[PDB]
Design a protein around this ligand. Sequence first.
Ligand SMILES: [Co+3]
Ligand SMILES: [Co+3]
Lengths: 255, 255
Amino acid sequence: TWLSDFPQAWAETGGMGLAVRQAPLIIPLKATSTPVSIKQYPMSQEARLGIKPHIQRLLDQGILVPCQSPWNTPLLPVKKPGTNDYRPVQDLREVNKRVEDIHPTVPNPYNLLSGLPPSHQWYTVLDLKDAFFCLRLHPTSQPLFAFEWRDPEMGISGQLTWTRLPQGFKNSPTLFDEALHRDLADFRIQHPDLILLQYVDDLLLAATSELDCQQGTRALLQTLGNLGYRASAKKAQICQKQVKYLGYLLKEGQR
Amino acid sequence: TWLSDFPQAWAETGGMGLAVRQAPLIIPLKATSTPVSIKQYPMSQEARLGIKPHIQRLLDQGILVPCQSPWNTPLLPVKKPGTNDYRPVQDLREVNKRVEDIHPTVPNPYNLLSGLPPSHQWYTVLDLKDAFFCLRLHPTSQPLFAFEWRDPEMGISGQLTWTRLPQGFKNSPTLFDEALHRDLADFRIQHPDLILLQYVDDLLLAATSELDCQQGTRALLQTLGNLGYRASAKKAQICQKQVKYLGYLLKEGQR
DNA sequence: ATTAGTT
DNA sequence: TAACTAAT
DNA sequence: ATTAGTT
DNA sequence: TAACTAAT
Ligand SMILES: [Co+3]
Ligand SMILES: [Co+3]
């Protein structure tokens, strides 16, 4: 009854996340970075219609808001099947170029697994849904990610931007990790007898007894939901001795 | 009166050389080297006629002799002007490939000049004419350099080879150096007060006083001629304080 | 007449 | 992955 | 619609 | 010096 007891912990029934303990993130520019406004590319009506639903709900979620910036980058309609079913994808490459770098705190997977004792044979693997959107963007920096939203077949607005850390931003991964490591510190302390592996949106908890593993998973789920994060209950793995994580298959401590 | 007193020392009036103190050189093959016979390329009558004079005189000098080998490499007619005036040039590249390597004893020019004191401001520069031909080839190894000599416009012989170290052989330079260093050892000993720079065919003697420099040049010339070497009196430099050597201009010790 | 070798 | 230069 | 980047 | 693949 996991999905049951932790309603606010799952994306499926907890609703959009929002890391409240985190202060709006400010994105430092390079000393010589000056705004770049690239005009939106033409888009077949089918494509424009394909991404409309998303945009809409994002606006409704206050994740996208109307604005006016000297910045502006194109929006690209991508698909997976033959070519149907589109997804909005913004090309932030020029913004990334003008943004200030930061030290990659994220530990590569291999060494990340190094810190894993055989003593803990029980696993739980969670992955957060829309990890980035849980982190607020400081108003000052929000202008950097604006893009133009039109609709020749429906008058429609103009330029919109993000209010949360966006997809395609070269530092979202690193910025998110740091954030989560900060927010899961208290947990690590309150459960010295557990091993929490953290790699951005991908989490791994390991314990000695399947009993602990479960008690651990609850404290964790309770905490995640509490702090404002949501994990995909769908693709989740709870209390096992064989679990697939970061592309490695964990079996008794193999891979 | 230099050309005068050392007749046997100059190519111009000493005649072909022959290092007698040297034992016929044997060229060691690689463990897996098996003979290669490449058929001669067609040659315009003009070209064949252009190189005839040389060949002839080489045969007359006993430097080229008739033979019959399983080896055989093409002969190429090369020129310098627009394209007239040809010179026989043999392509020994395949033979070099099948010949055993040896340690490059020749010191590169730069470090070669390193061993040169400022105290010696007087220079003499000689260069040997047909350096390689002064070294005899052991009968056993002579077969390696055979090539086919025809003449559709004059019945003519067939296959001929060298009796002396040939041009285009990847080890002639090194083999020659060693030889000359061996033959000029006694001189170095008998004239501790001189500096002899040796780089294959290119020699440089240096002394303190222009007087020594001259006395030195004589002992040297007498020795060269004696041993069987000939220097091009033509392009020679005797007793100077500024002499061009190995591509460096020596002035008071510059370059 | 071929070739080792180099943006 | 598209010739060219020296050099034998 | 562009692009970093790789025999 | 002759395209192509992922990826935003
Ligand atoms: Co070049
Ligand atoms: Co590739």
